[PDB]
Amino acid sequence: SQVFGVARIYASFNDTFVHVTDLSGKETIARVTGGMKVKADRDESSPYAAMLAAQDVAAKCKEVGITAVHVKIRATGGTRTKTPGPGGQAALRALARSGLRIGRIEDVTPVPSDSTRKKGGRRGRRL
Template identity: 90%
Template sequence: MAPKKKVERGAQENIALGPQVREGELVFGVARIFASFNDTFVHVTDLSGRETISRVTGGMKVKADRDESSPYAAMLAAQDVATRCKELGITALHVKIRATGGNGTKTPGPGA
């Protein structure tokens, strides 16, 4: 078998993600938190709601099914979302909290 050719790569440039803003200017996003009695969703979009920046659930952070809707799982999900928002340069969030509603209870679950 012939030896593999080595590919030389040039110097990597710093890639800036997110919008170009001036110093001290706020970049807003919308954090939609859906807290049911079975799971907690934290979904961050841009202001129009069309571009998803980050979406993390409580079930993605804990192993046990019974802990998906716990406040601890919601806290871990919020930490991941905050880290991703900081990477992309989002400095402010509008928070919208939603519960299950309908014929059932209108109060959010324990993860809200």
């Protein structure tokens, strides 16, 4: 009826990954990031760059035979931010508007229980 894959969106500050995989997760189908749609480093995290990227995985996915995908939204996590970056919402919006059906949505950032030490020192980034 519907052929299902999985879409993993890694919305970080400084970049955003959009790539689709099989349901099992061992075979990748289309990967494209925000850094292959812009020409300046400060724009790799913009909504526009993520939006252009998502339209490309939509292109490749259709031509491999996929019509629907689940969603796994992530941020750096661990000792890092744990907050979605700017490009996460643009990517999810772009996939929907490209006629690629959407199933379940879930957040999968690695939350560390209580963890190893965090960088920056005791006084933090003095800036």
